[PDB]
Amino acid sequence: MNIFEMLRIDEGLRLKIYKDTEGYYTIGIGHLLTKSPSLNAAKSELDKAIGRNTNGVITKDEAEKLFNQDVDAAVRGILRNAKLKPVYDSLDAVRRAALINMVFQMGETGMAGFTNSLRMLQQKRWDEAAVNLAKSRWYNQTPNRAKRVITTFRTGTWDAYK
Ligand SMILES: [Cl-]
Ligand SMILES: [Cl-]
């Protein structure tokens, strides 16, 4: 198990534009195209991303390519973030994957409301952090996925995914 397999499980794979849990146009493995309500706008962002006229549909290869970029971007984003980096550097490899998944899902920006949890994670207070993580809109909206990530942070193993 690794970050890629883990997100592939959490996000699924779809080759035609779809709306995500928040109802925003997405494609591939969780690749957000835009928060705009315009499907047109969404097809335009997609062609721009793929570099071709796609007509709202991509191949598997293209989705994996977006996915690789997106994972990479998330990691770099973390390393560039003053509030996130220290946390990430303090974690073991499994837990680091858990932090990546969250960022990937939510954006660094939404990462700010998790300040207290982050501190607990840095202090290695696993159960406390697990409890604090669950009091969040994130948990209330996508409870099954949230449970898997939280378990991952709580145990430091991939059991929730196996
Ligand atoms: Cl892109
Ligand atoms: Cl879920």
| Structural domain count, the chain | 1
**Ligand 2 centroid vs 52 CA: distance in angstroms?**
32
Gap from CA of 69 to ligand 2 centroid (Å): 23
Known binder of ligand: residue 36? no
User: What distance in angstroms lies between residue 29's CA and the mean position of ligand 1's atoms?
Assistant: 13
CA distance 142 to 21: 8
Question: How far apart are the C-alpha atoms of 134 and 142, rounded to whole Å?
Answer: 11
Sheet holding 25-28, edge to edge: 14-19, 25-28, 31-34
- Reply yes or no on whether 11 is catalytic: yes
Resolution in A: 2.1
Q: Active-site residue among 11, 45, 62, 70? A: 11
Which CATH number is 58's domain given? 1.10.530.40
In the residue annotation, 64 being an active-site residue is answered as no
Residue numbers of the domain that contains 80: 1-162
Residues 6 or more apart whose CB falls under 8 angstroms from that of 74 comprise 100, 103, 104
Q: Is 4 annotated as a binding residue?
A: no
- What does the alpha-carbon distance between residue 37 and residue 134 come to, in Å, rounded to a whole number? 30
3-class SS string, 30-44: CEEEECCCCHHHHHH
> What is the widest separation between alpha-carbon atoms in the chain?
50
> How many C-beta atoms surround the C-beta of residue 97 within 10 A?
22
